[PDB]
Amino acid sequence: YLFTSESVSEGHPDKVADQISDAILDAILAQDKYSRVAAETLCNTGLVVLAGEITTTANIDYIQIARDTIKRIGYCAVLVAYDKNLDQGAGDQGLMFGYACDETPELMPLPIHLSHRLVERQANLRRDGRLPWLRPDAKSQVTVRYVDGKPHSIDTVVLSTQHAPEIDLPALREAVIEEVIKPTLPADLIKGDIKFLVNPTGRFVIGGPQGDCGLTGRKIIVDTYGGAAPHGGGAFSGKDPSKVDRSAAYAGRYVAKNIVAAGLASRALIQVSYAIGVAEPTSVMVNTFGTGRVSDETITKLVREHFDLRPKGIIQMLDLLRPIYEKTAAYGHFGREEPEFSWEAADKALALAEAAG
Amino acid sequence: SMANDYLFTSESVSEGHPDKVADQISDAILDAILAQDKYSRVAAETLCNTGLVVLAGEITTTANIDYIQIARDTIKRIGYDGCAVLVAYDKQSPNLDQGAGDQGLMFGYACDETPELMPLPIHLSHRLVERQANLRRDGRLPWLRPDAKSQVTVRYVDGKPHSIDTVVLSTQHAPEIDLPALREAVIEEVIKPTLPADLIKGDIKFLVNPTGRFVIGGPQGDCGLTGRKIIVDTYGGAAPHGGGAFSGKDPSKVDRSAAYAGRYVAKNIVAAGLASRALIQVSYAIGVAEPTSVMVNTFGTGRVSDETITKLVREHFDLRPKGIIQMLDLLRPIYEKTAAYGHFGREEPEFSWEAADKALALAEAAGV
């Protein structure tokens, strides 16, 4: 079968909103790391709206931080409407999913991993001036052929990128295929039936907020597993680590990744859920899709013994009170093994393998 | 097939949850536009706060709409009766093989856990919050207010529902009512009458307003945005999701119409008795009509090969963007009603994607 995922660059209007939301979070967290933050962003042609709920001692110039963020991405009236120990109960109810699999060394499903890499690549080539006619907004779609339930080839890659008006399509499409697409695709998967569609709907001069309204939390599938796993619904950006929407999904990834790196399974899906004002999850379950070496329920039991899934437990486990979140807000929260991203360390793998037998 | 014991959870929110307010405003505006011009392009986004509604997005139409009156009417209908409104739409005046207007992946799903062919936990979650709305509006529980959330945890054994483990229900309420009386009322009136009798065992846990009082609700107590309840809108986590929000978008957006078609297909597969459950995944490429990929996974429950089912789907359904609109007659102002209590699993006459009107043909084909 053919399976497809997608990603967007840091310049996509929705990601502009996510990154503004998280730039603001990091600024707050730099001064007062215990702050409660629920920062929502809407951005438009002439308009940025910053809303949601904030509790802090920090003093931030929210407008300057939005402008700095838009500047760094590469591109307004501003409306600011904020309303400004381990047994602590969850601040809200909800469900969260974590996932991992052996399709890549980072233990992410292939299609979303390639999709993120394609847009990261175009941003890299923009910012180092190799393709100086590139502009911020970009979109990738990668369709992967599976045979034997394992990746076989890459059927189609679609990449649309914003660009300066001075360049013609023919040369743009050739440049993107040769410089963006081909180098990012693993050679073992590249075969005769590979289709490259670059800028299928033609000229793409106007991009970002100026071309299309963007909102925080509207790329939650691009942020996570690109369609390879179910999702609980919660957005990440703008939320401090006391919000289980973010902390529990991050812990889910940690758990799932450690189960697979432990050798317990070749893939692992974990659902967690919370009730408001209750520390222990209302539910936890692990599904290994028939690939587990020990029963899913025993893995579920091991998860409880080896990870602290209580909200403040997870903060302490992944050391989350750090201004590290603007970096999370483009190119996927999962699958990038940066030092800051504590949820990507397989540092419980050996302990899990040992406990299982 | 494999012996199992596990807990699975879904959630829903009432029509007065701020994100749902935003979704409903977005779709009320879509409805009003379509009333006057059913070929309109609408991508209407809403953000609402304490004393603030922001309406933004892209709209191409001949309709003349009082955007503020529609937002106000919607808020009033939900139960919330200065509220400044900022209208910043990018507005302008303007075959079956036409291409998709954007790329995306969409999933459709159906299973036999409920008569409506939806997975149980999202079903029960929705009905719990509909029940609190009903009891509010007919005055049986007049102290209730619009904002509420439900969450239902189901213990499955051998791949089948066995008992209800936990029900959470948080509801806004008048300051007049005391917490213990609130909780007893919610357990006996809202929760118990909604749960299936045979799934209530001795180990059931009711978590009603666990952190107590809840007087300031809706936009006043938290910000709402369009497209922030997309899991509540679909299958509660029982299926994968491809990304796209529904509300504020006219049927020409494949994010909405292909999701609906997907449900349609998946539901007719199960209704036909071809499978006890069906997941269908479809992908579109910008400017391409016929979709990239169409696959059906019955998870070992299909009475014929998955391949035969996927083949049957292409003979019996038109999955091209404009084909879906004709097949489901999507050019009608029917969307505000979708914007709370789930887009799937409610068998309203307007909801074309919930009709099992091809099941007989699929059954007759496969041999069921």
Side-chain angles (χ1 to χ4, degrees), chain A residues 1-149 151-173 175-192 194-202 204-209 211-357, chain B residues 1 3-80 82-94 96-159 161-212 214-219 221-280 282-325 327-336 338-363 365-368:
Chain A
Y1 61 99
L2 293 185
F3 189 97
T4 296
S5 283
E6 75 179 17
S7 194
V8 307
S9 78
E10 58 191 280
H12 188 280
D14 290 331
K15 287 285 142 206
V16 176
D18 285 323
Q19 293 162 92
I20 291 169
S21 280
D22 271 330
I24 274 155
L25 177 63
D26 295 339
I28 291 156
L29 283 188
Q31 283 176 66
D32 175 7
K33 69 172 168 172
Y34 301 105
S35 306
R36 314 315 222 195
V37 186
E40 308 287 11
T41 308
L42 177 153
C43 49
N44 218 34
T45 54
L47 194 58
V48 177
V49 180
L50 302 174
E53 291 67 48
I54 303 183
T55 306
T56 200
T57 63
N59 287 305
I60 300 291
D61 182 340
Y62 302 108
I63 290 171
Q64 188 58 44
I65 296 223
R67 284 177 206 276
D68 289 350
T69 304
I70 292 167
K71 188 217 168 177
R72 167 190 64 67
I73 287 148
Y75 289 115
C76 294
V78 185
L79 173 60
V80 182
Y82 294 124
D83 173 17
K84 184 196 174 293
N85 230 315
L86 292 193
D87 269 314
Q88 188 229 254
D92 197 358
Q93 68 166 56
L95 45 149
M96 301 84 195
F97 282 100
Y99 184 69
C101 72
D102 69 355
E103 292 187 12
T104 53
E106 300 81 9
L107 307 186
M108 286 289 302
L110 192 57
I112 190 57
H113 191 244
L114 284 178
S115 301
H116 285 314
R117 253 68 282 164
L118 282 164
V119 286
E120 216 174 347
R121 176 64 174 178
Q122 90 74 245
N124 291 346
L125 293 174
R126 185 166 53 74
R127 284 196 305 270
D128 74 21
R130 272 180 284 173
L131 301 177
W133 45 265
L134 283 177
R135 290 191 155 168
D137 200 345
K139 209 160 192 171
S140 67
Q141 198 199 41
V142 185
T143 305
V144 178
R145 190 175 175 198
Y146 287 69
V147 185
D148 225 331
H152 181 276
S153 65
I154 297 193
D155 173 75
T156 292
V157 191
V158 176
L159 200 154
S160 299
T161 177
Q162 191 191 5
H163 63 89
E166 299 88 34
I167 198 182
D168 56 291
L169 268 37
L172 183 153
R173 290 193 174 110
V176 162
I177 286 173
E178 298 298 294
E179 313 223 45
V180 193
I181 302 186
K182 273 187 174 75
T184 289
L185 296 181
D188 37 304
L189 297 176
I190 301 180
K191 276 133 190 184
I194 187 160
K195 294 78 141 276
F196 305 115
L197 302 163
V198 179
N199 279 52
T201 63
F204 189 177
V205 168
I206 319 185
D212 224 277
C213 189
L215 283 71
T216 306
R218 294 283 298 268
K219 283 290 164 294
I220 73 182
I221 299 308
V222 159
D223 278 336
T224 51
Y225 306 101
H231 200 289
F236 297 154
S237 293
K239 302 189 175 165
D240 75 85
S242 70
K243 310 299 192 281
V244 283
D245 276 348
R246 188 178 214 156
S247 76
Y250 284 10
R253 170 66 184 158
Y254 191 45
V255 167
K257 191 177 174 175
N258 277 271
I259 288 164
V260 173
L264 297 196
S266 59
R267 47 182 201 129
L269 179 73
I270 178 161
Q271 194 191 48
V272 176
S273 67
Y274 295 86
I276 191 158
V278 176
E280 229 77 46
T282 47
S283 78
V284 180
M285 70 131 289
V286 178
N287 191 350
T288 72
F289 303 89
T291 72
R293 313 214 190 175
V294 295
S295 78
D296 280 356
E297 24 277 308
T298 287
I299 293 163
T300 298
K301 282 194 188 178
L302 287 167
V303 164
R304 300 310 226 116
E305 292 177 41
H306 287 261
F307 303 84
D308 193 350
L309 288 174
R310 293 171 299 179
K312 273 184 66 57
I314 301 161
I315 287 167
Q316 169 181 286
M317 189 169 66
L318 296 159
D319 189 28
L320 294 180
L321 305 180
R322 282 177 293 145
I324 62 179
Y325 299 99
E326 180 173 19
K327 271 185 62 168
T328 75
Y331 312 112
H333 295 241
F334 308 138
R336 298 147 74 204
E337 299 181 334
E338 306 290 346
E340 27 277 304
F341 304 161
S342 58
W343 46 98
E344 294 290 330
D347 64 354
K348 276 173 187 307
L350 274 52
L352 277 166
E354 174 113 47
Chain B
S1 204
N4 279 336
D5 193 356
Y6 64 92
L7 304 172
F8 191 87
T9 307
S10 292
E11 85 181 329
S12 191
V13 313
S14 78
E15 59 192 297
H17 182 276
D19 286 327
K20 247 53 201 73
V21 179
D23 284 325
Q24 280 161 103
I25 294 168
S26 278
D27 274 336
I29 276 155
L30 174 66
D31 280 350
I33 289 159
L34 288 170
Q36 298 187 38
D37 178 1
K38 83 189 192 166
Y39 300 108
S40 293
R41 304 298 171 79
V42 186
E45 312 293 3
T46 311
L47 172 163
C48 42
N49 217 28
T50 333
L52 185 47
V53 168
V54 184
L55 307 176
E58 295 61 56
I59 293 168
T60 301
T61 195
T62 60
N64 292 302
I65 267 61
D66 191 332
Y67 296 117
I68 286 165
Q69 190 57 57
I70 291 167
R72 280 176 190 283
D73 286 346
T74 299
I75 290 165
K76 159 170 162 190
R77 201 252 314 143
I78 289 161
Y80 294 115
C83 182
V85 186
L86 177 66
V87 184
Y89 291 125
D90 173 348
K91 183 172 143 211
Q92 49 250 121
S93 289
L96 293 90
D97 299 73
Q98 176 182 302
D102 199 17
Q103 74 184 33
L105 188 68
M106 298 77 31
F107 287 99
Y109 189 65
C111 64
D112 69 358
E113 290 185 4
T114 59
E116 292 79 18
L117 304 187
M118 286 289 288
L120 190 66
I122 190 42
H123 182 74
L124 294 188
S125 288
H126 285 314
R127 305 289 82 70
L128 276 173
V129 287
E130 278 197 86
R131 177 74 174 172
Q132 92 77 249
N134 294 333
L135 272 42
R136 181 168 59 72
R137 289 196 175 97
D138 64 31
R140 282 182 278 183
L141 298 176
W143 42 266
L144 293 167
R145 260 99 190 111
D147 199 351
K149 301 182 90 171
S150 65
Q151 198 180 258
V152 183
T153 291
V154 170
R155 185 186 183 208
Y156 287 74
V157 165
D158 292 356
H162 179 261
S163 63
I164 305 308
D165 176 270
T166 309
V167 176
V168 183
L169 208 145
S170 290
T171 179
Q172 195 188 356
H173 59 85
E176 341 306 320
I177 201 81
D178 55 287
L179 268 45
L182 181 149
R183 297 194 181 103
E184 165 144 283
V186 179
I187 290 168
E188 296 301 318
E189 305 253 30
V190 180
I191 308 184
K192 285 198 198 166
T194 296
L195 298 180
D198 57 24
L199 301 176
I200 309 183
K201 313 298 190 198
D203 71 354
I204 196 167
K205 296 167 281 302
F206 303 116
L207 294 177
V208 181
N209 290 40
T211 43
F214 188 172
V215 174
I216 292 187
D222 42 322
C223 192
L225 287 86
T226 298
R228 293 281 296 263
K229 285 285 158 304
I230 70 186
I231 299 313
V232 163
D233 278 344
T234 50
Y235 305 103
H241 199 303
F246 295 156
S247 298
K249 299 184 182 181
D250 69 276
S252 69
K253 273 63 165 189
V254 294
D255 274 345
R256 193 174 201 165
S257 60
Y260 284 15
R263 168 58 174 172
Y264 187 54
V265 175
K267 191 181 184 178
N268 279 269
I269 286 166
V270 181
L274 292 188
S276 74
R277 56 192 189 108
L279 172 66
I280 177 170
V282 318
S283 45
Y284 296 87
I286 312 174
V288 186
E290 205 73 46
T292 294
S293 66
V294 173
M295 205 225 53
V296 186
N297 186 355
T298 70
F299 307 92
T301 75
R303 291 191 59 192
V304 304
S305 74
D306 274 14
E307 197 209 321
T308 300
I309 296 178
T310 303
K311 262 175 69 63
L312 255 38
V313 169
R314 294 198 146 285
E315 242 118 15
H316 283 95
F317 300 87
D318 195 330
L319 269 38
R320 300 169 294 180
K322 282 196 104 204
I324 294 170
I325 290 183
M327 183 180 60
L328 293 172
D329 185 15
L330 292 187
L331 297 185
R332 294 172 290 152
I334 55 164
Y335 297 102
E336 192 176 355
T338 71
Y341 309 122
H343 294 240
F344 308 136
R346 284 187 293 138
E347 301 184 341
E348 304 293 333
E350 303 78 32
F351 298 170
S352 220
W353 48 95
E354 296 287 326
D357 52 17
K358 290 176 182 287
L360 276 41
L362 294 179
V368 183

